[PDB]
Design a protein around this ligand. Structure first.
Ligand SMILES: CCCCCCCCCCCCCCCCCC(=O)OC[C@H](COP(=O)([O-])OCC(O)COP(=O)([O-])OC[C@@H](COC(=O)CCCCCCCCCCCCCCCCC)OC(=O)CCCCCCCCCCCCCCCCC)OC(=O)CCCCCCCCCCCCCCCCC
Ligand SMILES: CCCCCCCCCCCCCCCCCC(=O)OC[C@H](COP(=O)([O-])OCC(O)COP(=O)([O-])OC[C@@H](COC(=O)CCCCCCCCCCCCCCCCC)OC(=O)CCCCCCCCCCCCCCCCC)OC(=O)CCCCCCCCCCCCCCCCC
Ligand SMILES: CCCCCCCCCCCCCCCCC[C@@H](O)O[C@H](CO[C@H](O)CCCCCCCCCCCCCCC)COP(=O)(O)OCC[N+](C)(C)C
Ligand SMILES: CCCCCCCCCCCCCCCCC[C@@H](O)O[C@H](CO[C@H](O)CCCCCCCCCCCCCCC)COP(=O)(O)OCC[N+](C)(C)C
Ligand SMILES: CCCCCCCCCCCCCCCCC[C@@H](O)O[C@H](CO[C@H](O)CCCCCCCCCCCCCCC)COP(=O)(O)OCC[N+](C)(C)C
Ligand SMILES: CCCCCCCC/C=C\CCCCCCCC(=O)OC[C@H](COP(=O)(O)OCCN)OC(=O)CCCCCCC/C=C\CCCCCCCC
Ligand SMILES: CCCCCCCC/C=C\CCCCCCCC(=O)O[C@H](COC(=O)CCCCCCC/C=C/CCCCCCCC)COP(=O)(O)OCCN
Ligand SMILES: Nc1ncnc2c1ncn2[C@@H]1O[C@H](COP(=O)(O)OP(=O)(O)O)[C@@H](O)[C@H]1O
Lengths: 459, 56, 98, 40, 54, 347, 320, 42, 107
């Protein structure tokens, strides 16, 4: 695993020693090379795992997330190239350093053979993201947003640490292999109930769960484009990865401890999908759509069936890609309008046809159009929930309909209609933006050819 | 021009070299765990006449 | 434990309570501190003499010396406070607040 | 088109002796710039 | 949107915590600086500890 | 004052601390405490003004009362057991009085009131000395009698100290009061693990001393005693503000910084002894310390506050008196998490 | 080995260098008077060192090269704009006043450090003391607001509560019509816009406040225009008067050491000149301050410390 | 300000670094030799 | 009220700089035409040409480490064996009961 960690570390001295007008080229090229190297991890095996050493190991749940994390950085660099043009060389190097540190922390988090190291890196990811949100944020609310994005997370995970060490005082180890092989049931007791709560609430808050999601619209709206990319695409999947890793010791208590969370997620998907219908902001709409998709993933994880896990993994990957592309499109519109309001900019297919095509494809992918991996995860989770209970489909069905609605609404209000007359600063889309859109959308349609690469270890 | 591009393009080799370094490090890590090489109850094999270790 | 030790401890507790009261006049606070030290000296002397621990006879005098030094220190501080305010009331020490 | 940065009005929030002063503590004044008080 | 997400879900967890912490901070830091009160509290805690923990 | 006199007074303070730490006799420990208190007062009054005199007299009153209580505890212990060696105290009442005296010397709640006022009154170097070197002796004495303390009293005083520090740090604008409340909170954190493992106490003390040394050195480097004067710093030395922001993040316990090392370790140790609720409450309470650290970081470096016209002249002049060990202090206070198992050295 | 506590411990005692000749002297008067020539002649005759009056770009001469920097990078104010439109909307007048006061404070610190390090006396024009009269002239004429003068009073008291006033104050008294005639003869186009009320206010403030306040603690030389050209009489009167009322005879070696600490490390001298109170005349927002600081850092000899600038010509960098 | 590279300080620093490195290498060799002697490796 | 009504000295908000006005054929990467063109070239070559195509082909031809065809052949031979000799195909018990020691109750 060091063959990928070491180049990510070496990205920092290369950036800090580069010329004042050549940092972006070097960063993008070497990030793409690192992603190409990390593509090797996709060759998983039906056997146990790729146990590299005592500290790092790779599974078919960790491999797609690692590949997505490595692939995200070049896209974030291309997205941030624009609004950091008038920025001093030292501050641009600091921004690239923060991005590289975040990628390194995520890469070390996704392997994380030991659970305490996983938690330490899980919380280490919080610092560069907070710095990015609070420093390079345009609006005045960013600071408050950052505060939220911090405290919620910590409020979730401070008990977890205690629980973690408590386990090592009883079980004696926190290595995931030993934990899996020496698993023992949790008796129905109040102490076990609170241990379950401490283990679960840590990852519930960052997913986020409905009722604990108030930090997410603030963090995504107030953050710069790269921050929105990293939060929507990868940083949301940390909770799901942690839950799928840690639910191996919570049985059979979960069989009755998942009812409040299942109810909360199955109603919050509807609530957030309806919230998306009436939104005056594009970024808030995308954030609430992300909340709905993550609530569906939470339902899948709480069901705890093989089809649930497969659908959860596929949906996480597809949602990360789709949300990243949607945030990029919204930022491209904002950089010309400088308002971030849906109804101010209208009739854009007359002026930017290729951007309208990109918007259509992104909306269709969000709308879960077959045979995309989005719908693969959707159908897997839906069938698993139907097996769990034949009534859930009703709620699920409603969500699907509502989803499509707001998606096309986002497509119709911004692209269709008559253009705004008093906006004459709509320049033709650059090659950079179109290349970013293509690099976002082509991997989705290529992954739909080989779904088993993102279906997880239970395929 | 020699001795001038090196002053400007020495950073380009920084990422690739580290990569191979990591590979070397991976091999070093592998040696420590050879405590069960050819001792597995599933892959227990008699060595070839010109073979010393099953894997490296 | 005899009643004399109880009386000495009661005197020390009374002096401590008087020091902690702070009606006014920091000079009275230093007086209460000196009374506490006197109670300590008397109790230590009685304990050391009763048990015939000869080498411990050094302890009381040393104690007094050190404590008296602190007494002088306190007086100096008090004087300076007065030279700032013209008086030694406790309530004049309210510039630094929590 | 410009990143928002704190202005005078925002900065005056921290100019007080204590954050969010109460009605009782409103009349309180921050300490002198140098830690020297007038001999009055 | 308004009643649940923007009002009550905001009031329960974050705003209540902020209000409670602000009130506790105000109560703790509202000291006039009088050592009279400080040492009266010292006397009270010295008195309470001996009775409670012995 | 004269440099010779200042050096002699500093040597006297350090020698009193050393006498406290190396003595096996209770009278010698009391003598060391008396020497430390006697030589500390002029240090607090190096820059004469009403504020320094007020802080010095408050400090003298508090320390004299604590020393008298300590002497009475020694006397009662001698009465109920004719022993002068620092060992099992053999008497619950003497133990309680010794604990209260040592907590008043340390500044633990509810004896915390003097710390913010004395720190605000004195200068930055005096505050550095008071918050770093004045904790070595009482903590050493407490560690020597760790098996004797009542766990209930120590734990409740530690929890009260953490709560008061976290709550009081929210209302402060002056930086010295912020550092005083942070010191109170860290004292509460340290004193909560004495009954279980003194090695954790010493490790936390070392980490806290490094972090607070770095922070006071940074505050000395840029002459700021309030929030706005600190916010003015970005226009001259942005590197100082960035380093101070990183240090503030470290003090809050955010991994992978050094400040996460003690708490984590302490929590783990306190989980060995079947104690679960208390570490959880300490974590949620230290969230408040993290909050006001975050507010200071927002006001310091993560944003750019308005400046003044005269600052341009400050651009033309360099910081002449350059302090040493500051880069080392920052490095130890930020990037020593991977060297955690080294705490096995019984530091 | 720079002067420090170790130097004071071993050999550096600055009370020995004083030979009754130091006698810091300030020669001050009204605008465009003969005080400059008098100060120069006093310095020449008494063997002291003459410090020219502090201007806008005085601090630029003391750091790096002596060449002044741009007005935007140093001062952000001009005297010519003040003369042309004293009631400017952008608050140029008080920005000028504060920059001049801070420059005078730096000049006084430089003169004091030279005197304490060499023992040779110095001669100065208007110091931090007697600068305030211009402030008064700006207030009575209505050029600046009351919050402005409160700011100036705060900064002045905080900065000057720690410096020793000069031994001798020399005042060159010139009538307002005569000084107006000299201003007319000078021919500087901006200075002919000065009104008679401004000079009358400045003169009244100088006589009413400066003369009695310095009288009870120092020695005062109120000299007229005709009797000022004879510098021999001035120097003779300087020698004749004896200083026994000021704090200078009360002074001791330890407080000399503290003062010599203060006068060096100019960042501590100017520390309180940027107190965080926000008047629109002096406060500058984040964006403008960032832009100006970045522009200043791009100067050839300002990016690093004075000895660590490759473009200037500093060599052997990697061993310094 | 105008100050030449202090050759005395540079020489002291370089000598200290070289001496520390040599002492560290010698200490490591002595330690490994003593370890092998005590445990009877070579 | 002679106040300037200006709270502080501030730069005016600059207008956004159009990349096309000073550089047709911009590609929108930088304001330096040569650096911008080479940035476009390297981005396209490493994203579309290098990673997107070669990585996709590498993933397509990954060796079967999941043991799918191996499982196919194993199941085929097992079904052949069980059909040939009349065995009841799939066995309901994963482990042989002779090797399982159930706890006697006698209740
Ligand atoms: C039907 C199969 C066709 C196969 C032939 C090969 C096609 C290859 C396409 C690969 C992906 C396209 C790239 C996406 C962006 C397009 C680039 C662009 O800028 O366009 C401008 C370009 C030039 O026009 P221009 O005038 O210069 O630009 C002006 C404006 O852009 C104005 O632009 P516009 O007005 O012309 O509109 C742009 C256009 C193009 O934009 C798109 O939206 C195309 C993407 C549609 C997918 C939406 C996401 C949903 C998930 C589906 C995932 C399928 C991927 C499968 C694997 C693909 C491998 C990469 O949009 C559409 O045409 C509407 C698409 C809605 C179709 C809904 C049906 C989807 C399911 C169909 C079955 C798929 C599986 C079959 C399995 C069973 C049979 C074997 O036009 C095109 O190149 C169009 C390409 C043809 C459209 C493809 C639509 C269906 C094919 C999907 C993949 C094929 C499945 C494999 C089975 C083969 C048998
Ligand atoms: C682990 C526990 C951690 C301990 C916490 C840190 C301890 C801090 C207290 C040390 C003394 C305070 C100090 O030096 O200034 C703070 C100092 C900051 O320097 P500064 O603010 O520029 O000093 C301003 C002074 O106030 C300027 O005052 P000054 O110019 O009047 O003083 C003259 C100077 C020079 O003294 C002399 O002139 C030598 C003459 C010999 C006197 C003969 C007396 C014998 C009878 O003497 C000193 O500075 C005190 C040195 C005492 C010897 C310590 C061994 O912070 C540190 O030095 C960091 C110390 C690193 C931690 C300890 C070692 C690592 C473990
Ligand atoms: C706000 C955004 C979402 C955040 C997360 C929300 C979800 C948190 C809920 C956690 C799970 C449920 C809590 C307790 C579950 C215990 C099972 C209980 O529900 O069943 C009954 C239990 O009845 C009562 O619940 C008993 C406890 C009553 C007191 C608890 C308070 C209930 C309301 C508190 C609401 C406050 C929510 C906010 C907290 C900060 C059956 O009684 P019994 O079979 O005999 O005993 C079962 C337990 N045994 C087997 C170990 C013995
Ligand atoms: C910020 C991280 C901490 C940094 C600490 C400062 C580092 C510089 C200190 C320089 C050396 C320190 C000591 C000097 C060495 C000789 C003295 C030695 O002989 O004393 C020993 C004392 O041992 C020393 O304490 C060990 C020194 C090692 C300190 C560092 C441990 C930090 C580990 C976690 C942080 C990672 C550090 C990374 C590098 C700084 C004898 O111990 P002993 O008298 O018989 O027992 C007394 C202790 N009891 C009472 C608890 C039993
Ligand atoms: C634009 C207008 C049209 C122009 C184009 C005309 C041509 C049309 C062709 C386009 C689609 C038509 C369908 C034709 C598909 C043929 C190829 C396909 O069948 O191959 C697939 C193979 O595709 C790849 O497996 C999927 C692509 C790899 C995905 C990796 C993405 C690249 C990295 C980017 C970063 C990753 C981000 C996300 C993290 C996971 C399935 O292979 P499989 O049937 O099984 O067996 C292959 C042979 N074996 C047996 C030897 C193994
Ligand atoms: C037992 C004690 C438990 C302590 C729990 C600590 C919770 C961590 C957050 C603490 C923040 C409290 C302080 C506070 O909010 O002050 C009010 C403050 C006043 O504004 P200032 O910036 O301080 O001043 C500017 C005007 N002069 O109001 C705000 O701005 C609030 C903005 C930040 C919101 C943070 C939201 C935190 C709550 C989310 C969940 C975390 C709860 C943790 C405990 C969970 C319960 C088990
Ligand atoms: C975004 C906000 C989320 C905040 C976190 C929500 C989850 C909080 C869950 C509790 C946190 C601490 C749990 C303890 C960690 C597990 C350790 C454990 O299970 O050990 C138990 C200890 O159990 C406890 O101590 C639990 C006591 C809880 C103390 C803290 C209370 C916090 C608030 C409780 C109500 C909140 C529950 C619902 C929260 C919903 C989300 C906000 C057994 O102890 P022993 O003595 O060894 O065994 C007994 C037999 N010999
Ligand atoms: N505090 C001040 N405010 C306004 N103008 C000042 C101030 N100090 C000096 N000046 C200007 O500096 C110029 C020269 O100084 P001055 O002493 O009056 O004449 P001279 O150059 O002959 O010594 C004059 O035009 C004077 O107005």
């Amino acid at each position: 695993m060091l063959k990928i960690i070491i180049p990510t570390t070496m990205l920092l001295p290369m950036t800090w020693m580069s010329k004042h007008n050549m940092i972006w080229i070097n960063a993008t090229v070497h990030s793409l090379l690192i992603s190409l190297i990390s593509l090797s991890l996709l060759n998983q095996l039906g056997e146990n795992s790729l146990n590299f050493s005592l500290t790092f190991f790779s599974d078919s749940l960790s491999a797609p997330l690692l590949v997505l994390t490595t692939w995200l950085l070049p896209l974030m660099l291309m997205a941030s190239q624009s609004h950091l043009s008038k920025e001093t060389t030292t501050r641009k190097k600091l921004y690239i350093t923060m991005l590289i540190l975040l990628q390194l922390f995520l890469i070390m988090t996704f392997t994380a053979t030991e659970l305490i190291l996983f938690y330490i890196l899980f919380e280490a990811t919080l610092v560069p993201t907070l710095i990015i949100i609070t420093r390079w944020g345009n609006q005045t609310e960013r600071l408050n947003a950052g505060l939220y994005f911090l405290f919620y997370t910590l409020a979730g995970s401070l008990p977890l640490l205690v629980a973690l060490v408590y386990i090592q005082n009883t079980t004696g180890s926190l290595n995931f292999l030993i934990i899996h092989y020496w698993s023992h049931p949790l008796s129905n007791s109040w102490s076990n109930i609170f241990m379950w709560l401490a283990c679960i609430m840590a990852f519930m808050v960052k997913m986020p769960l409905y009722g604990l999601h108030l930090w997410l619209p603030k963090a995504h709206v107030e953050a710069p484009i790269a921050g929105s990319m990293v939060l929507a695409a990868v940083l949301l999947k940390l909770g799901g990865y942690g839950m799928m890793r840690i639910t191996t010791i919570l049985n059979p208590l979960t069989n009755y401890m998942a009812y409040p969370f299942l109810m909360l997620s199955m109603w919050g998907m509807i609530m957030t999908s309806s919230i998306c219908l009436r939104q005056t902001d594009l970024k808030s709409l995308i954030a609430y759509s992300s909340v709905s998709h993550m609530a569906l993933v939470i339902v899948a994880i709480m069901i705890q069936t093989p089809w649930s896990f497969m659908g959860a993994t596929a949906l996480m990957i597809a949602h990360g890609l789709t949300s990243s592309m949607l945030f990029c499109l919204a930022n491209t519109n904002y950089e010309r309008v400088h308002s971030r309001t849906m109804i101010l900019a209208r009739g854009l297919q007359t002026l930017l046809p290729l951007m309208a095509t990109w918007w259509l494809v992104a909306s269709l992918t969000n709308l879960a159009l077959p045979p995309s991996i989005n719908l693969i995860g959707e159908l897997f989770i839906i069938t698993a929930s139907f097996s769990w209970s034949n009534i859930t489909i009703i709620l699920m069905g409603m969500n699907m309909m509502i989803t499509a609605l707001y998606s096309l609404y986002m497509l119709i209000t911004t692209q269709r209609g008559k253009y705004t007359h008093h906006i004459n600063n709509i320049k033709p889309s650059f090659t950079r933006e179109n290349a970013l859109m293509a690099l976002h959308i082509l991997p989705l349609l290529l992954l739909t050819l080989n779904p088993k690469m993102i279906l997880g270890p239970l395929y | 021009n020699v001795l001038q591009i090196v002053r400007d393009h020495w950073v380009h080799i920084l990422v690739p070299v580290g990569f191979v370094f990591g590979c070397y490090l991976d091999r070093r890590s592998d040696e420590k765990l050879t405590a069960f090489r050819n001792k597995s109850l599933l892959f227990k094999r008699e060595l070839r006449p010109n073979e010393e270790v099953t894997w490296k | 434990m005899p009643l004399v030790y109880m009386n000495i401890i009661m005197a020390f507790a009374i002096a401590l309570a008087g020091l902690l009261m702070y009606r006014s006049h920091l000079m009275s606070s230093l007086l209460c501190l000196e009374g506490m030290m006197l109670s300590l000296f008397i109790m230590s002397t009685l304990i050391i003499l009763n048990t015939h621990f000869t080498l411990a006879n050094m302890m009381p005098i040393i104690l007094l010396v050190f404590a008296a030094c602190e007494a002088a220190l306190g007086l100096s501080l008090l004087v300076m406070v007065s030279n700032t305010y013209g008086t030694d009331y406790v309530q004049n020490l309210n510039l630094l607040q929590c | 088109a410009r990143q928002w940065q704190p202005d005078v009005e925002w900065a005056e929030q921290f100019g007080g002796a204590v954050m969010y002063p109460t009605k009782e503590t409103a009349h309180w004044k921050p300490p002198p710039w140098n830690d020297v008080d007038p001999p009055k | 949107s308004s009643l649940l997400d923007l009002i009550w879900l905001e009031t329960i967890l974050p705003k209540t915590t902020s209000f409670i912490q602000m009130k506790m901070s105000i109560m703790v830091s509202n000291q006039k600086g009088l050592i009279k009160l400080y040492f009266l509290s010292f006397l009270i805690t010295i008195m309470i500890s001996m009775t409670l923990f012995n | 004052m004269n440099p010779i006199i200042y050096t002699t007074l500093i040597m006297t303070v350090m020698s009193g601390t050393m006498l406290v730490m190396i003595s096996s006799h209770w009278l010698l420990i009391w003598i060391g405490f008396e020497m430390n208190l006697l030589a500390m007062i002029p240090v607090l009054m190096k820059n004469f003004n009403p504020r320094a005199t007020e802080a010095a007299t408050k400090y003298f009153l508090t320390q004299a009362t604590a020393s008298m209580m300590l002497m009475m505890a020694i006397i009662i212990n001698l009465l109920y057991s004719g022993q002068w060696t620092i060992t099992k105290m053999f008497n619950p009442v003497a133990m309680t009085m010794m604990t209260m005296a040592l907590a008043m010397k340390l500044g633990l709640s509810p004896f915390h009131f003097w710390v913010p006022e004395v720190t605000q009154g004195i200068s930055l170097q005096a505050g550095l000395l008071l918050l770093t070197w004045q904790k070595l002796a009482p903590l050493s004495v407490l560690c020597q009698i760790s098996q004797s303390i009542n766990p209930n009293l120590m734990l409740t005083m530690a929890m009260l100290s953490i709560l008061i520090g976290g709550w009081g740090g929210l209302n402060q604008t002056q930086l010295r009061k912020i550092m005083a409340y942070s010191s109170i909170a860290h004292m509460g954190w340290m004193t909560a693990v004495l009954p279980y493992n003194t090695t954790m106490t010493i490790l936390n003390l070392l980490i806290y001393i490094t972090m607070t040394l770095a922070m006071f050195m940074l505050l000395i480097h840029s002459s700021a005693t309030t929030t706005l004067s600190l916010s003015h710093t970005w226009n001259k030395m942005p590197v100082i503000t960035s380093l101070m922001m990183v240090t503030l993040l470290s003090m809050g316990g955010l991994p992978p910084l050094s400040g996460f090392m003690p708490k984590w370790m302490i929590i783990q140790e306190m989980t060995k002894n079947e104690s679960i609720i208390m570490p959880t409450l300490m974590a949620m309470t230290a969230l408040l310390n993290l909050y006001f650290y975050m507010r200071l970081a927002y006001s310091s470096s993560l944003t750019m506050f308005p400046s003044t016209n005269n600052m341009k002249m400050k651009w033309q002049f360099e910081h002449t008196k350059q302090m040493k060990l500051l880069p080392t202090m920052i490095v130890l206070s930020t990037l020593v998490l991977p060297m955690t198992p080294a705490l096995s050295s019984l530091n | 080995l720079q002067y420090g506590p170790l130097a004071f411990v071993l050999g550096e005692r600055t009370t020995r260098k004083l030979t009754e000749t130091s006698k810091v002297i300030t020669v001050d008067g009204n605008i465009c008077s003969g005080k400059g020539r008098l100060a120069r002649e006093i310095a020449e005759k008494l063997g002291l060192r003459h410090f020219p009056e502090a201007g806008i770009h005085y601090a630029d001469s003391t750091t790096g090269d002596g060449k002044p920097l741009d007005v935007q990078l140093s001062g952000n104010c001009s005297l010519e704009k003040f003369y042309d439109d004293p009631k400017s909307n952008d608050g140029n007048s008080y920005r000028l006043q504060s920059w001049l006061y801070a420059s005078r404070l730096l000049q006084y610190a430089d003169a004091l450090e030279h005197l304490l390090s060499t023992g040779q006396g110095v001669v100065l024009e208007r110091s931090i003391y007697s600068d305030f009269v211009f402030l008064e002239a700006m207030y009575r004429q209505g050029f600046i607001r009351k919050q402005c003068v409160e700011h100036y009073n705060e900064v002045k008291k905080v900065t000057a509560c720690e410096y020793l006033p000069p031994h001798v104050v020399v005042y060159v008294d010139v009538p307002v019509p005569e000084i107006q005639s000299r201003i007319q003869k000078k021919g500087n186009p901006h200075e002919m816009k000065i009104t008679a009320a401004y000079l009358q206010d400045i003169e009244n403030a100088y006589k009413k406040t400066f003369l009695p306040e310095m009288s009870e603690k120092c020695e005062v030389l109120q000299y007229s225009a005709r009797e000022a050209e004879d510098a021999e009489k001035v120097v003779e009167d300087i020698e004749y008067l004896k200083c026994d009322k000021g704090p200078w005879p009360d002074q001791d070696d330890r407080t000399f050491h503290r003062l010599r600490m203060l006068v060096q490390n100019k960042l501590e001298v100017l520390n309180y000149t940027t107190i965080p109170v926000y008047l629109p005349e002096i406060t500058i927002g984040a964006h403008q301050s960032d832009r100006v600081f970045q522009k200043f850092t791009e100067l050839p000899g300002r990016k690093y410390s004075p000895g660590y600038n490759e473009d200037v010509g500093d060599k052997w960098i990697w061993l310094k | 300000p105008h100050g030449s590279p202090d050759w005395l300080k540079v020489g002291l620093t370089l000598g200290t670094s070289v001496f520390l490195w040599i002492y560290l290498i010698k200490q490591h060799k002595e330690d490994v030799l003593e370890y092998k002697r005590r445990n009877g490796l070579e | 009220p002679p106040e300037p009504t200006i709270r502080l000295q501030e730069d005016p908000d600059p207008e956004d700089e159009n990349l096309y006005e000073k550089n047709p054929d911009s590609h929108g990467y930088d304001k330096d035409p040569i650096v911008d063109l080479w940035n476009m070239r390297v981005v396209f070559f490493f994203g579309f040409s290098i990673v997107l195509v070669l990585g996709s082909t590498f993933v397509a031809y990954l060796p079967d480490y999941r043991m799918q065809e191996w499982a196919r052949r194993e199941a085929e031979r097992l079904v052949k064996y069980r059909e040939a000799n009349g065995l009841p195909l799939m066995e309901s018990n994963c482990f042989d009961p002779n090797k399982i020691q159930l706890p006697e109750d006698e209740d």
